[PDB]
Amino acid sequence: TIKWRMQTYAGAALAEHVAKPAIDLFNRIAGDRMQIELYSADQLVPTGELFRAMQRGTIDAVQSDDDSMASPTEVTVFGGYFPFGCRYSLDVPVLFNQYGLKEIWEEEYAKVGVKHVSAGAWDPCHFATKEPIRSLKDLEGKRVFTFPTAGRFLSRFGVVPVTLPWEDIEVALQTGELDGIAWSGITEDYTVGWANVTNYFLTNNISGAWIGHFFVNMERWEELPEDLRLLFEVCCEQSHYHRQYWYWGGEARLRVHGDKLELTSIPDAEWDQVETAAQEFWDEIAAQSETKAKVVEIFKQYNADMRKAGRPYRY
């Protein structure tokens, strides 16, 4: 009866793990009442058009971060990898459900005809590169695929952010068009084959957890009967849950036992310059609007409270 098309930010090999299992489950349960067809990175429309395509109803739903999509909202810069925002993946659903971020995202997207269904965590952000990164100077001049706001941050350190479609990254790494990636953690690197075409993995992250969401065109959302609305919401939470343990398990296991990437580390005392720079970056963002200031203050109070709480949040 009801037919949706969903496009995800994830390339095909990544979609197999971060969206497909929950959509397949939705489809097995819904049966003839409703089916969701899942399309991967840049398949139905280009990234630059993803948000507008959903808004106007060409595509019914989207799984994506705000930042790569360049959504016309005040919270776009907090999606993807907001530098040093969340130490832990569970910080994301806690910030959204308990510290007010859900209501802010709902309002921002509704103003533009889109239903924010649910936010979730993905992986930490690490450099994986052809050449080893052992110091901050080693970052200078490197052409790396990353997210827009993270890239803007990293530019302070001489990184050159380069944007290409996801399906092209593997060959771009192979030819040296890219010097590396700062788009993902180690789980994705091994799963999607990027570990096969890069050599080194830097242990110092610039975010403990990517922020992405499920979104639906508001008119399509309002057309849903209640039981299918609830079924979609639950399947999306199942998708988020699966990612919580897929990444928690994958990052540790592959760091310790993987053999396709050699680990490097920048000394803490040196990396502290990157953390310092990040809090100036947050201030620059807060300067830009009231909503941005509000969200930055929430990130600050949350992180300050983690320090006061102690173990196992902070040591």
Looking at the Cβ atoms of 68 and 207, the one nearer to a second copy is: 207
C-alpha span between 254 and 87 (Å, rounded): 19
Footprint of a second copy on this chain (CB under 8 A)?
Answer: 25, 28-29, 31, 87-91, 93-94, 97-98, 203, 208, 226-227, 230-231, 234-235, 237-238, 240-242, 244-245, 248-249, 251-253, 255-257, 305-306, 308-313, 315
Q: Does 232 bind Cl ion (CB under 5 A)?
A: no
Nearer to a second copy, 83 or 93 (CB): 93
Binding-site residues for ethanolamine, in ranges, read: 9, 188
Strand 200-202 versus strand 61-64 pairing type = unpaired
Quote the least distance from Cβ 226 to Cl ion, whole Å: 19
Q: How far is the CB of 33 from a second copy (least distance, A)?
A: 11
CA distance 154 to 138: 13
The minimum distance between CB 290 and a second copy, in angstroms, equals 25
Binding-site residue numbers are 9, 188
CB 203 within 8 A of CB 263: yes
If the CB atoms of residues 3 and 257 are measured against a second copy, the closer one turns out to be: 257
With respect to Cl ion, which residue has the nearer C-beta, 177 or 237? Answer: 237
The interface partner of residue 225, options being Cl ion, a second copy, none and the CB cut-off 5 to 8 Å by kind, is none
Residues that bind Cl ion (CB under 5 A): 21-22, 96, 102, 118-119, 239
